[PDB]
Design a protein around this motif. Structure first.
Motif, PDB file in Angstrom:
ATOM      1  N   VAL A 137       0.830  -1.201   0.000  1.00  0.00           N
ATOM      2  CA  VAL A 137       0.000   0.000   0.000  1.00  0.00           C
ATOM      3  C   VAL A 137       0.866   1.253   0.000  1.00  0.00           C
ATOM      4  CG1 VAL A 137      -1.610   1.351   1.381  1.00  0.00           C
ATOM      5  CG2 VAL A 137      -2.032  -1.088   1.003  1.00  0.00           C
ATOM      6  N   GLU A 138       1.933   1.260   0.802  1.00  0.00           N
ATOM      7  CA  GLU A 138       2.793   2.436   0.877  1.00  0.00           C
ATOM      8  C   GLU A 138       3.569   2.638  -0.419  1.00  0.00           C
ATOM      9  OE1 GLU A 138       5.300   1.981   4.252  1.00  0.00           O
ATOM     10  OE2 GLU A 138       3.652   1.751   5.686  1.00  0.00           O
ATOM     11  N   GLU A 139       4.145   1.561  -0.957  1.00  0.00           N
ATOM     12  CA  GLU A 139       5.007   1.691  -2.127  1.00  0.00           C
ATOM     13  C   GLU A 139       4.228   2.183  -3.341  1.00  0.00           C
ATOM     14  OE1 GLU A 139       7.234  -1.834  -2.888  1.00  0.00           O
ATOM     15  OE2 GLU A 139       8.386  -1.709  -1.022  1.00  0.00           O
ATOM     16  N   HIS A 140       3.076   1.575  -3.614  1.00  0.00           N
ATOM     17  CA  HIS A 140       2.300   1.894  -4.803  1.00  0.00           C
ATOM     18  C   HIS A 140       1.238   2.954  -4.553  1.00  0.00           C
ATOM     19  CE1 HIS A 140       3.850  -2.209  -5.873  1.00  0.00           C
ATOM     20  NE2 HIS A 140       4.095  -1.563  -6.999  1.00  0.00           N
ATOM     21  N   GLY A 141       1.241   3.579  -3.381  1.00  0.00           N
ATOM     22  CA  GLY A 141       0.256   4.617  -3.101  1.00  0.00           C
ATOM     23  C   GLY A 141      -1.172   4.172  -3.313  1.00  0.00           C
ATOM     24  N   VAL A 142      -1.510   2.962  -2.858  1.00  0.00           N
ATOM     25  CA  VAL A 142      -2.883   2.492  -2.969  1.00  0.00           C
ATOM     26  C   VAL A 142      -3.790   3.398  -2.147  1.00  0.00           C
ATOM     27  CG1 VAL A 142      -4.434   0.551  -2.615  1.00  0.00           C
ATOM     28  CG2 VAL A 142      -2.074   0.143  -3.352  1.00  0.00           C
ATOM     29  N   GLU A 143      -4.988   3.655  -2.667  1.00  0.00           N
ATOM     30  CA  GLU A 143      -5.896   4.623  -2.070  1.00  0.00           C
ATOM     31  C   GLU A 143      -7.140   4.011  -1.450  1.00  0.00           C
ATOM     32  OE1 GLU A 143      -5.711   8.325  -5.053  1.00  0.00           O
ATOM     33  OE2 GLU A 143      -5.450   6.370  -6.022  1.00  0.00           O
ATOM     34  N   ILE A 144      -7.652   2.911  -1.998  1.00  0.00           N
ATOM     35  CA  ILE A 144      -8.870   2.283  -1.503  1.00  0.00           C
ATOM     36  C   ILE A 144      -8.580   0.823  -1.193  1.00  0.00           C
ATOM     37  CG2 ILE A 144     -11.226   1.590  -2.045  1.00  0.00           C
ATOM     38  CD1 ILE A 144     -11.422   4.079  -3.825  1.00  0.00           C
ATOM     39  N   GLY A 145      -8.987   0.380  -0.008  1.00  0.00           N
ATOM     40  CA  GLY A 145      -8.876  -1.011   0.391  1.00  0.00           C
ATOM     41  C   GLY A 145     -10.255  -1.635   0.536  1.00  0.00           C
ATOM     42  N   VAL A 146     -10.438  -2.777  -0.120  1.00  0.00           N
ATOM     43  CA  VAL A 146     -11.674  -3.545  -0.039  1.00  0.00           C
ATOM     44  C   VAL A 146     -11.441  -4.714   0.908  1.00  0.00           C
ATOM     45  CG1 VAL A 146     -13.514  -4.656  -1.338  1.00  0.00           C
ATOM     46  CG2 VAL A 146     -12.114  -2.884  -2.417  1.00  0.00           C
ATOM     47  N   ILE A 147     -12.210  -4.763   1.990  1.00  0.00           N
ATOM     48  CA  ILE A 147     -12.069  -5.792   3.015  1.00  0.00           C
ATOM     49  C   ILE A 147     -13.067  -6.900   2.708  1.00  0.00           C
ATOM     50  CG2 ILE A 147     -12.206  -6.333   5.461  1.00  0.00           C
ATOM     51  CD1 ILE A 147     -11.409  -3.498   6.085  1.00  0.00           C
ATOM     52  N   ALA A 148     -12.554  -8.082   2.376  1.00  0.00           N
ATOM     53  CA  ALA A 148     -13.365  -9.263   2.097  1.00  0.00           C
ATOM     54  C   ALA A 148     -12.873 -10.446   2.920  1.00  0.00           C
ATOM     55  CB  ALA A 148     -13.351  -9.596   0.607  1.00  0.00           C
ATOM     56  N   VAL A 149     -12.613 -10.199   4.200  1.00  0.00           N
ATOM     57  CA  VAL A 149     -12.194 -11.245   5.131  1.00  0.00           C
ATOM     58  C   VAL A 149     -13.312 -11.491   6.137  1.00  0.00           C
ATOM     59  CG1 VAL A 149      -9.794 -10.580   4.824  1.00  0.00           C
ATOM     60  CG2 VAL A 149     -11.103  -9.674   6.757  1.00  0.00           C
ATOM     61  N   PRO A 150     -13.329 -12.637   6.815  1.00  0.00           N
ATOM     62  CA  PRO A 150     -14.351 -12.871   7.841  1.00  0.00           C
ATOM     63  C   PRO A 150     -14.350 -11.770   8.892  1.00  0.00           C
ATOM     64  CG  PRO A 150     -12.546 -14.470   7.989  1.00  0.00           C
ATOM     65  CD  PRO A 150     -12.419 -13.784   6.669  1.00  0.00           C
ATOM     66  N   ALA A 151     -15.497 -11.629   9.562  1.00  0.00           N
ATOM     67  CA  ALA A 151     -15.686 -10.517  10.490  1.00  0.00           C
ATOM     68  C   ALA A 151     -14.610 -10.488  11.571  1.00  0.00           C
ATOM     69  CB  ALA A 151     -17.076 -10.596  11.123  1.00  0.00           C
ATOM     70  N   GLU A 152     -14.171 -11.659  12.039  1.00  0.00           N
ATOM     71  CA  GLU A 152     -13.237 -11.699  13.160  1.00  0.00           C
ATOM     72  C   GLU A 152     -11.898 -11.047  12.838  1.00  0.00           C
ATOM     73  OE1 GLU A 152     -15.228 -14.045  12.105  1.00  0.00           O
ATOM     74  OE2 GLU A 152     -14.234 -15.974  11.770  1.00  0.00           O
ATOM     75  N   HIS A 153     -11.593 -10.816  11.561  1.00  0.00           N
ATOM     76  CA  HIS A 153     -10.317 -10.230  11.167  1.00  0.00           C
ATOM     77  C   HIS A 153     -10.472  -8.924  10.395  1.00  0.00           C
ATOM     78  CE1 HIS A 153      -8.978 -14.649  11.445  1.00  0.00           C
ATOM     79  NE2 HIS A 153      -8.504 -14.021  12.506  1.00  0.00           N
ATOM     80  N   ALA A 154     -11.689  -8.385  10.295  1.00  0.00           N
ATOM     81  CA  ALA A 154     -11.898  -7.168   9.516  1.00  0.00           C
ATOM     82  C   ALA A 154     -11.267  -5.959  10.197  1.00  0.00           C
ATOM     83  CB  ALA A 154     -13.392  -6.942   9.286  1.00  0.00           C
ATOM     84  N   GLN A 155     -11.520  -5.789  11.498  1.00  0.00           N
ATOM     85  CA  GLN A 155     -10.991  -4.627  12.207  1.00  0.00           C
ATOM     86  C   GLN A 155      -9.469  -4.588  12.161  1.00  0.00           C
ATOM     87  OE1 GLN A 155     -12.501  -2.025  13.322  1.00  0.00           O
ATOM     88  NE2 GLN A 155     -10.687  -1.063  14.227  1.00  0.00           N
ATOM     89  N   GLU A 156      -8.817  -5.731  12.386  1.00  0.00           N
ATOM     90  CA  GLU A 156      -7.358  -5.765  12.353  1.00  0.00           C
ATOM     91  C   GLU A 156      -6.827  -5.364  10.982  1.00  0.00           C
ATOM     92  OE1 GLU A 156      -5.159  -5.535  14.141  1.00  0.00           O
ATOM     93  OE2 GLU A 156      -3.300  -6.408  13.365  1.00  0.00           O
ATOM     94  N   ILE A 157      -7.456  -5.861   9.915  1.00  0.00           N
ATOM     95  CA  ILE A 157      -7.032  -5.497   8.567  1.00  0.00           C
ATOM     96  C   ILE A 157      -7.328  -4.027   8.290  1.00  0.00           C
ATOM     97  CG2 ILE A 157      -7.572  -5.835   6.134  1.00  0.00           C
ATOM     98  CD1 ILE A 157      -7.597  -8.778   6.566  1.00  0.00           C
ATOM     99  N   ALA A 158      -8.436  -3.516   8.828  1.00  0.00           N
ATOM    100  CA  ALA A 158      -8.768  -2.109   8.630  1.00  0.00           C
ATOM    101  C   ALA A 158      -7.694  -1.201   9.217  1.00  0.00           C
ATOM    102  CB  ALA A 158     -10.132  -1.798   9.248  1.00  0.00           C
ATOM    103  N   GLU A 159      -7.152  -1.569  10.381  1.00  0.00           N
ATOM    104  CA  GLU A 159      -6.145  -0.731  11.022  1.00  0.00           C
ATOM    105  C   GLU A 159      -4.813  -0.785  10.286  1.00  0.00           C
ATOM    106  OE1 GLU A 159      -5.847  -1.603  15.197  1.00  0.00           O
ATOM    107  OE2 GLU A 159      -8.006  -1.336  15.496  1.00  0.00           O
ATOM    108  N   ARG A 160      -4.477  -1.934   9.693  1.00  0.00           N
ATOM    109  CA  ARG A 160      -3.251  -2.015   8.907  1.00  0.00           C
ATOM    110  C   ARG A 160      -3.338  -1.139   7.664  1.00  0.00           C
ATOM    111  NH1 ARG A 160      -1.885  -8.567   9.248  1.00  0.00           N
ATOM    112  NH2 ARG A 160      -1.828  -8.660  11.540  1.00  0.00           N
TER     113      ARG A 160
END
Ligand SMILES: NC(=O)c1ccc[n+]([C@@H]2O[C@H](COP(=O)([O-])OP(=O)(O)OC[C@H]3O[C@@H](n4cnc5c(N)ncnc54)[C@H](O)[C@@H]3O)[C@@H](O)[C@H]2O)c1
Ligand SMILES: NC(=O)c1ccc[n+]([C@@H]2O[C@H](COP(=O)([O-])OP(=O)(O)OC[C@H]3O[C@@H](n4cnc5c(N)ncnc54)[C@H](O)[C@@H]3O)[C@@H](O)[C@H]2O)c1
Lengths: 203, 203
Positions: A137-160
DNA sequence: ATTTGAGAAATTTATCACAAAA
DNA sequence: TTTTGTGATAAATTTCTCAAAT
C-alpha cells in the motif's frame, strides 16, 4: 450537505452517462426525474448544494453536468484499489474491476491461506501474501482497500490499511469498522434481513 | 415505521446474537449503544415502535429481545432463495448462503449461457437453464430472488420472478428495478463512488 | 439505585412555490 | 415559451426529559 445527497448524486451520474450514450445533449430536471422515479424538485435541490449548472428556461447540458458531478464525486481520476481476501467476494470484485471498471484499478489482492497465496485471482492478478499488505500500500500509493475477510479479522485489517496510508475502505464483513478514514459498508446478510422485514410487513 | 429503523433493527439482532454467544442474559440500552456506537435513546425509541420488551430499572432480557426482533424481522422461518446469474456475484452468494447461512437456503441457480448450464455452482447446486426459472419458482414456492445478471436484463428477470409469485428481490445490477414486491439493492459501484465522494470531501 | 418508555422538543430532510432569467 | 434556483413551508427523524416502574 445532507447525508442522502451523495447517494442520489451517484444515481444522477449513471443516468447522465446513459443519456450521453443516447445522444441527448440537454435534459430537464423533470426528464431526469421521470426516469429515476424522483421528484424534479429534489434533483434541483441536491444540485443546488454544489452550484448552478442549469440554464433557466432551458435545462441542463448533459455533458457539462456529467463532468461537474464527476468532479464532485472524485471520479475524474483513476483510483488504485487493493482487495484483502481472495474468497468468494474478493475474487468476484477483482474479476469485475479488472474487466468492467476503468476508473477503479485493482493492482493487488492479498490472502493469508498458503493454498491461495500463489494462485491467480484475476487476469494479471496474482494473490499476494497478506504479510506484504502494508508494504504494498505504501510503495504503490494504494488509495482504496476492499475488506473481504471474515468478520473476526476485519478490524485488524482495517487498522493495517489505515496505518499504511489508505484513504478509504469498502467493507464487506458484517461488523462496524472503527477507523479515521471514510468507510462504506456492504452487508449482504443485513440486506436480506431488511428484505424479509419488508416482506412480512406486507403479509 | 421510520425508514432507518429496519436497518438498525438488523444491527441490534446481530449484536444480541453475539451477547448470547458470550453468555450475557441481561443487557441495558446503554450497554448495547456502547458496542454499536449509537445513542441509548435511539435504541429505546426504535424498540418502542414494536412493543415494550424492557424491564424498568433492569434492562432487556437478551434472549427474549433476540427472539422478539427475530420475529419482527421474519427470521424465525427458513427462506427459499434462487440466484439468477451464475457469474462472479451469483457464485459468491451461492457458495456463502449454502455454507454460512442457516435461515436462507438457496435451492436453485439459473443462467442463460450454455457453457455454464449444467455446471455446479456450489455444493450440491447445479446451474439450471434460466428458461426454467418461472416453473422452478412456482413449484418449490421460492420466496426471494437474487438478481445477478447484467443491468440490461435485470428488469426482465425481475418481472418473471414477480410473475412466478416471488415475494422479494435482492438486486445486484446497477439499475432501478420496477416491480410490486419489495426490493433491496446492493450497488457495489455506487458504493465506491460514494466512498470517493467522502474521500475528496475530507481532503 | 437504576433503567425503560412515553411525550415533547430539537434537528434534519423533502417538498413547495414563484421570481428570475435564458 | 419554459425551467432553474432560492426561501420558506412541511414532513420526517433524532434527541432529550423524566415519570414510572422496579
Ligand atoms: N460471499 C457472500 O455472499 C457473503 C454474504 C454475506 C456476508 N459475507 C461476508 O463477506 C466477507 C467475505 O465473504 P466470502 O464469501 O468471500 O468468504 P470466503 O471464506 O470465501 O473468503 C474469505 C477470505 O479471507 C481470507 N482471510 C481470512 N483471514 C485473513 C486475513 N487476516 N488476512 C488476509 N486474508 C484472510 C481467507 O483466506 C479467505 O480466503 C465475510 O466477512 C462474509 O461474512 C459474504
Ligand atoms: N462483480 C462485481 O463485483 C460487480 C460490481 C459492480 C456491479 N456488478 C453488477 O452485478 C451484476 C452481476 O455481476 P457479475 O460480476 O457476476 O457479472 P458476470 O459476467 O460475472 O455474471 C453474470 C451472469 O449473468 C448471466 N446472464 C446474462 N443474462 C442472463 C439472463 N437473461 N438470464 C440468466 N442469466 C443471464 C450471464 O450468463 C453471466 O453468467 C451485474 O449487473 C454487475 O453490473 C457486479
Amino acid at each position: 450537505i445532507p447525508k442522502p445527497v451523495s447517494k442520489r448524486l451517484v444515481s444522477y451520474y449513471m443516468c447522465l452517462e446513459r443519456l450521453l450514450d443516447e445522444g441527448v445533449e440537454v435534459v430537464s430536471s423533470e426528464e431526469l426525474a421521470r426516469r429515476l422515479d424522483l421528484k424534479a424538485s429534489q434533483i434541483r435541490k441536491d444540485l443546488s448544494y454544489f452550484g448552478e449548472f442549469g440554464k433557466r428556461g432551458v435545462g441542463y447540458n448533459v455533458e457539462h453536468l456529467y463532468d461537474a458531478i464527476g468532479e464532485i464525486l472524485g471520479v475524474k481520476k483513476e483510483w488504485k484499489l487493493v482487495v484483502v481476501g481472495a474468497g468468494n467476494i474478493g475474487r468476484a470484485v477483482a474479476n469485475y474491476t479488472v474487466m468492467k471498471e476503468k476508473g477503479f484499478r485493482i493492482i493487488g489482492i492479498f490472502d493469508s491461506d498458503p493454498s491461495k497465496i500463489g494462485k491467480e485471482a484475476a487476469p494479471g492478478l496474482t494473490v499476494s501474501d497478506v504479510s506484504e499488505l502494508e508494504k504494498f500500500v505504501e510503495e504503490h500509493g494504494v488509495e482504496i482497500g476492499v475488506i473481504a475477510v471474515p468478520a473476526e479479522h476485519a478490524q485488524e485489517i482495517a487498522e493495517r490499511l489505515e496505518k499504511a496510508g489508505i484513504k478509504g475502505i469498502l467493507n464487506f464483513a458484517p461488523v462496524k469498522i472503527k477507523v479515521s478514514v471514510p468507510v462504506e459498508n456492504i452487508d449482504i446478510t443485513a440486506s436480506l434481513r431488511v428484505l424479509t422485514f419488508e416482506i412480512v410487513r406486507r403479509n
